[PDB]
Amino acid sequence: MNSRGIWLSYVLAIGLLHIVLLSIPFVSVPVVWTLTNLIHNMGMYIFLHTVKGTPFETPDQGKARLLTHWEQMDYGVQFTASRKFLTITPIVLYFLTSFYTKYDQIHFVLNTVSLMSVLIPKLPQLHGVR
């Protein structure tokens, strides 16, 4: 990883997922903030908690194909410099989908549920169960 360069691409990915999912005048509503929260939490859960294995071939001969991406990265070290960054930024997206939501408890039940299915697998307790 290039800690400036891998984060900058990751932030620009949210900005590109926001600008394409914007105002779309058949659906002319500011709930596209909520949709930016809905797609990304389901996107991370696939590529960091569902897909299991490594994309190469014979990395270190036999290596852990029964371990997810979140728990194989950084050689299994708890809170280094990036594991915080990946668990501090999606919780900040909760704050932006409540300043432009102005809570009305119908999209709220889709934002807290989609937040817990990201926050609970990042806890350093459960490590290998699924």
């Binding site: 809170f79 915080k84 501090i88 909760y94 704050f95 102005k102 809570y103």
Partner: peptide, 22 residues
């Protein structure tokens, strides 16, 4: 102008800070 989540929305700021120092 909250409705009913402003306590848990308060504790999420607290849970960031409890997560940060390690």
């Amino acid at each position: 102008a909250p409705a009913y989540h402003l306590i848990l929305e308060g504790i999420l700021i607290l849970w960031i800070i409890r997560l940060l120092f390690s």
